[PDB]
Design a protein around this nucleic acid. Structure first.
Ligand SMILES: Cc1cn([C@H]2C[C@H](O)[C@@H](COP(=O)(O)OP(=O)(O)OP(=O)(O)O)O2)c(=O)[nH]c1=O
Ligand SMILES: [Ca+2]
Ligand code: NA
Ligand code: NA
Ligand code: NA
Ligand code: NA
Ligand code: NA
Length: 320
DNA sequence: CGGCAGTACTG
DNA sequence: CAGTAC
DNA sequence: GCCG
């Protein structure tokens, strides 16, 4: 990217808006930052600024102020609460509303939180792993965590397929957590083995805490055995085989890629989720689904793209 | 003006 | 439900 | 914040 001196300043404002709960404004900044991250050359004109998709007059004004001043004045009037709100919302299970409430209650540090705040069960796990959950692991370690889950699941049924998704499948060198998708061509055997799997991984000491436990979705905390190991976030989802392609696509991301793809499906009277790509979806004037539509067969990720009129993108090309 | 992805846990 | 999360 |  040849616009670092601009995007670096925009990232600051976008994070401020995010921690402060202004999610749609933050969203607009994010997209503009990506667009600026993509454009081939340094932006030099307000007209060249408005020329990019995701950059309006408001954002070009800011970009222009940067090129002529080397500075964005609004960065000087970011509230003093923002660093504290960021600190608090980096606790897993605390978001903007909880951080803002803690702030209004007078809390300013994690010592304040530890000693005086009311914490949910999730937020107490998040706090005790605060530093660890802010770390990314090398992908080599994501592979060891995936193999640990896979070998535990395959002990129950050899026919279980286990695939690490998210940034791991997109080829990144580091991973924020591990996303393991499980299915079975059986169409049936995926049922039941999920709860038994978690008990097996608990019994050996691999799983150290549970955050979310659904019937096909688990979010938790694991740590490989031996010295020099940190606690790592682990997500596991178990899906029927008929949903594998859409679950793989969802679980692989990126998040912004999924949202773009789902928005595109909406323009075409379709709807894409981790369960299925559906056609003939009826919506009202507020974009809210009013009728379900029909599931389209998607045996492979390529079918989803094809049915959406798009060229296939391999995982590494799905960061946005 | 008004949507901005679609879904799933928690309590 | 609101909040938080993937 | 942007865009239809
Ligand atoms: C956070 C998030 C994730 N997802 C999907 C796509 C993500 O790849 C997948 C796993 O969630 P993450 O683990 O948060 O995604 P990631 O692995 O891509 O993160 P990073 O690039 O920083 O390493 O869940 C959504 O569809 N929407 C979201 O808001
Ligand atoms: Ca991940
Ligand atoms: Na534009
Ligand atoms: Na958080
Ligand atoms: Na006090
Ligand atoms: Na994850
Ligand atoms: Na809750």
């Amino acid at each position: 990217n040849h616009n670092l001196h601009i995007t670096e300043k925009l990232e600051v404002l976008a994070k401020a808006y995010s921690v402060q709960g202004d999610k749609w404004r933050a969203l607009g900044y994010a997209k503009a930052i990506n667009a600026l991250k993509s454009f081939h050359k340094p932006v030099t004109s307000y007209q060249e600024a408005c020329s990019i998709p995701g950059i309006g007059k408001r954002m070009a004004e800011k970009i222009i102020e940067i090129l002529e001043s080397g500075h964005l004045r609004k960065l000087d009037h970011i509230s003093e609460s923002v660093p504290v709100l960021e600190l608090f919302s980096n606790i897993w299970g605390a978001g903007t509303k909880t951080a803002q409430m803690w702030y209004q209650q007078g809390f300013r540090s994690l010592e304040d939180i530890r000693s005086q705040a009311s914490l949910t069960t999730q937020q107490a796990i998040g706090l005790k792993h605060y530093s660890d959950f802010l770390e990314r692991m090398p992908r080599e370690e994501a592979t060891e965590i995936e193999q640990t889950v896979q070998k535990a699941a395959q002990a129950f049924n050899s026919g279980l397929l286990c695939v690490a998704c998210g940034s791991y499948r997109r080829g990144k060198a580091t991973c924020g957590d591990v996303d393991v998708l499980i299915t079975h061509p059986d169409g049936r055997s995926h049922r039941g083995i999920f709860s038994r799997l978690l008990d097996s991984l608990r019994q050996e000491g691999f799983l150290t805490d549970d955050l979310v436990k659904g019937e096909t979705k688990y979010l938790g905390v694991c740590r490989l055995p031996g010295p020099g190991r940190r606690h790592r976030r682990l997500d596991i989802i178990v899906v029927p085989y008929s949903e594998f392609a859409c679950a793989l696509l969802y679980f692989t991301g990126s998040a912004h890629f999924n949202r773009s793809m789902r928005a595109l499906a909406k323009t075409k009277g379709m709807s894409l989720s981790e369960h299925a790509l559906s056609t003939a979806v009826v919506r009202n004037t507020h974009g809210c689904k009013v009728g379900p539509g029909r599931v389209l067969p998607t045996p492979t990720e390529k079918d989803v793209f094809r049915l959406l009129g798009l060229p296939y993108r391999e995982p590494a090309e799905r960061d946005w």
